[PDB]
Write a protein that binds this DNA or RNA. Structure first.
Lengths: 77, 149, 271
RNA sequence: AGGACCGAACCGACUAAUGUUGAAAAAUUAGCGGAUGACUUGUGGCUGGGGGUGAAAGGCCAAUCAAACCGGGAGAUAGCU
RNA sequence: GUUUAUUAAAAACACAGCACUGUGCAAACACGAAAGUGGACGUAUACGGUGUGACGCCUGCCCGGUGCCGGAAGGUUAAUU
RNA sequence: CUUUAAUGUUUGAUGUUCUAACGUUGACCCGUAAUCCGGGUUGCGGACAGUGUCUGGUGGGUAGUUUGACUGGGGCGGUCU
């Protein structure tokens, strides 16, 4: 599924409001990308299907803390 | 971000400086393989005292690297025999793997990723000079000899 | 040779058969066959993705060596076998160490011939070696796109690839379509032209011949209904529209190529 | 040798009559076409409704099809009877 | 040869042949929110689409309209800023 | 201060080269007596491609709809203040 690993973001639904204000259902999709991250504690390349916003989150939090967050709720990485 | 440099990388830092570098360069180059460490207002003061010991111990490993560079110059020439034809045409080719394998079997072991061969392709019989990457500011030149077999 | 069948009965009047007297008559090499399942033009979902495919005579897959992975071994041909899976014929070659494999039969290859694939690979029709050791300007078939992929160019009957220039670590090739393509010199290919080239002269003579080759009849859109085809139909024969595919894509001129990834390997399109 | 010929089984259904609350919700009788191939048939499997399949008739999809059947919205709506 | 099972078997469909066009392989195209599958375990003498329809003689003129394929001198032109 | 010349920074445009992101339906090994997948070592592309948000163009491929009334039946013609 198109779900960010660290932020837990999921696709949402909206309308395609045109000039005539017509309502057509659509989906807003997150910017998922499979990226490899380096960790020093475990000395391994870990692959995560993370969103673009999530990458900025792990920049300040650090790869160690976000891995703890994944392990806190049982997420598999 | 405000990553702090830890090596002698190209001219954007002075072995520890808070610069405005985009995250593309910071990631996949600085975090995976040394040369820096991210500063998130917590490692700024932790690594301030770390400049005394790791930088000092880094200043001596580079001296050891130069020692291997000087030691490998004990031959100045390595001879490899490979199949070839007339007018210096070689059936095969010699890359970093062959050079590393020849050097490891002859003398001090060397890594094939350390071979600096931009231009780069061995297609003619005779003398060829290949440079190495022992350090960011130190280079070693070794002359390789390919002989038609 | 080509023989025009006598018009003994209607349906055989226009038959032009292709006879290959030196083609072996008998069962193929049993260890080199694999089970082949006819899809019928249907994917895993069961829908007809591609039309006009179904029926036909049952066929057994022949393991044809396209990679030539084992190199530097002399080889000798033994027999030529008909391969229903492809237009070109195949030859059973026996290696000097006792291994038998299937290769695409080139034009100049007949029974009792010797071929040599290797690093040296003296230039003879049938030898296999990388482009770095092949002279520029020779007829070459079974060309690869990547080193080790194995025979991805010029596999049909009477087709060949001509080398025009190297110009660095790549090689520029004149494909049979008429397009210039650049491939890396590490690709391995075979000298000479592929075999039987009179494949045009066969005309199958009748509707039934095309039926057992796995081709179902095609229904023209102008004879269909508007709910079925964009061309649809009216009172009598009426078209009144630009020719399009049944899925509403304009035909007779609209270029459908959209890759933007292999474009750098192409320097000139066909014409 | 033949998408050859005549003609049984088999497949199909061109003509006529009967039947039309029929023996039968398309049949019977007399005729008719193909009948070694683009043939036919048994068993099992797959393609599901804006979809399938279609040598194309908008034909077929459980005695139905210019959008199958069942249930629900639903006591739809009807300036009409 | 196929077709409106159940009022139309045909001059309708298909057909071998011909022509145009698209497609260099992770091909075009199609089915699928995607993975993936068919194409094809095939590789331009191959595959898809379109039109015509054995064979013989031929297929004349017009690029203004629509579509398609290229061009860049010049004008307009969104998000953005 | 108007103008311009010259080091050092910041931001755009073009061109070459490089790899670490990314791709790999290229090769080898392992999980593993496995054409899935994953991991590792190379090779080739490479900041391209592709994906997400916004945006312009095309878009009966698909969908929801509209397509007036009077009328010596309706349509056409004519009229609607």
């Amino acid at each position: 599924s198109r779900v960010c690993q660290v932020t837990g973001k999921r696709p949402v639904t909206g309308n395609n409001r045109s000039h005539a204000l017509n309502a057509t259902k659509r989906r807003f999709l997150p910017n998922l990308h499979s990226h490899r991250f380096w960790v020093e504690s475990e000395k391994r390349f870990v692959t995560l299907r993370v969103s673009a916003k999530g990458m900025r989150v792990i920049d300040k939090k650090g790869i160690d803390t976000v891995l703890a967050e994944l392990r806190a709720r049982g997420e598999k990485y | 971000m405000q990553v702090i440099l830890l090596d002698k990388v190209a001219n954007l830092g002075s072995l520890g400086d808070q610069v405005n570098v985009k995250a593309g360069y910071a990631r996949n180059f600085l975090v995976p393989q040394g040369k820096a460490v991210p500063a998130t207002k917590k490692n700024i003061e932790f690594f301030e005292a770390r400049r005394a010991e790791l930088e000092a111990k880094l200043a001596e490993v580079l001296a050891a690297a130069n020692a291997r560079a000087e030691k490998i110059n004990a031959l100045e020439t390595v001879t490899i025999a490979s199949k070839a034809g007339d007018e210096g045409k070689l059936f095969g080719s010699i890359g970093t793997r062959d050079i590393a394998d020849a050097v490891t079997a002859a003398g001090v072991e060397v890594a094939k990723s350390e071979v600096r061969l931009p231009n780069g392709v061995l297609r003619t019989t005779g003398e060829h000079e290949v440079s190495f990457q022992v350090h960011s500011e130190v280079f070693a030149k070794v002359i390789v000899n390919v002989v038609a077999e | 040779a080509v023989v025009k069948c006598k018009p003994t009965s209607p349906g055989r009047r226009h038959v032009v058969k292709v006879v290959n007297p030196e083609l072996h008559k008998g069962k193929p090499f049993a260890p080199l066959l694999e089970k082949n399942s006819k899809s019928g033009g249907r994917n895993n979902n069961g829908r007809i993705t591609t039309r006009h495919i179904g029926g036909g005579h049952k066929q057994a897959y022949r393991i044809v060596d396209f990679k030539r992975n084992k190199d530097g071994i002399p080889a000798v041909v033994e027999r030529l076998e008909y391969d229903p899976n492809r237009s070109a014929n195949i030859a059973l070659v026996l290696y000097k160490d006792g291994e038998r494999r299937y290769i695409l039969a080139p034009k100049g290859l007949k029974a009792g011939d010797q071929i040599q694939s290797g690093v040296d690979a003296a230039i003879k029709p049938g030898n296999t070696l990388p482009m770095r050791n092949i002279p520029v300007g020779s007829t070459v078939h079974n060309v690869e796109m990547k080193p080790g992929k194995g025979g991805q160019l010029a596999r049909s009957a009477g087709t060949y690839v001509q080398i025009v220039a190297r110009d660095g670590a790549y090689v520029t090739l004149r494909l049979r379509s008429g397009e210039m393509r650049k491939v890396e010199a590490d690709c391995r290919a075979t000298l000479g032209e592929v075999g039987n080239a009179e494949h045009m002269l066969r005309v199958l003579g009748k509707a039934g011949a095309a039926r057992w080759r796995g081709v179902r009849p095609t229904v023209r859109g102008t004879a269909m209904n508007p709910v079925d085809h964009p061309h649809g139909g009216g009172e009598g024969r009426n078209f009144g529209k630009h020719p399009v595919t049944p899925w509403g894509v304009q035909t007779k001129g609209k270029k459908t190529r959209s890759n933007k990834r292999t474009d750098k390997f192409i320097v000139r399109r066909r014409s």
